[PDB]
Design a protein around this ligand. Structure first.
Ligand code: NI
Ligand code: NI
Length: 165
């Protein structure tokens, strides 16, 4: 079953109304926040709240771009959640679930807790039906031209099942 998923009300998400997406998502994109990292709940919460505002205010997104985020606390934060579109990858925001690891992982990778959480969340995703049984996993930089999710992180995920080798 899905990990603890700390809801939007927890980190005080500015509430909005964004374009819902047809849930049988066919892909999974692993992206990294590229910004600061967090190790305790209260810190991750603040970072998530700020990524949303930035995304809405200066990026002009409808809400935070990611469906879910993962902190070094091993906690899984709801982004826009399952039922909403994302603003994370071009032409995939309505068909790919974007999971953002909070922090910067080009050299060093997320800890084992952060990683275990993503895979557990991905699993229930396929199990619950939010992901097609034959969905395809891939890195952010595999679809668009971006320095994400970082070598370290990339090398780990390329290891996971259904990864688009
Ligand atoms: Ni599970
Ligand atoms: Ni474990």
């Amino acid at each position: 079953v899905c990990p603890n998923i700390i809801k939007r009300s927890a980190w005080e998400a500015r509430e909005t109304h964004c374009p819902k997406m047809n849930l049988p998502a066919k892909y999974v994109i692993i992206i990294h926040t590229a910004g600061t990292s967090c190790t305790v709940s209260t810190d991750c919460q603040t970072v998530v709240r700020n990524i949303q505002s930035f995304h809405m205010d200066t990026r002009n997104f409808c809400d935070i771009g990611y469906h879910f985020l993962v902190g070094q606390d091993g906690g899984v934060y709801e982004g826009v959640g399952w039922h909403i579109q994302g603003s994370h990858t071009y032409g995939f925001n309505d068909i790919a679930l974007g999971i953002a690891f909070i922090g910067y992982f080009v050299e060093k990778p997320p800890n084992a807790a952060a990683l275990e959480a993503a895979q557990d969340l991905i699993q229930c995703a396929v199990v619950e039906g939010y992901l097609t049984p034959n969905y395809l996993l891939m890195g952010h930089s595999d679809v668009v031209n971006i320095l994400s999710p970082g070598q370290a992180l990339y090398n780990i995920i390329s290891t996971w099942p259904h990864f688009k080798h």
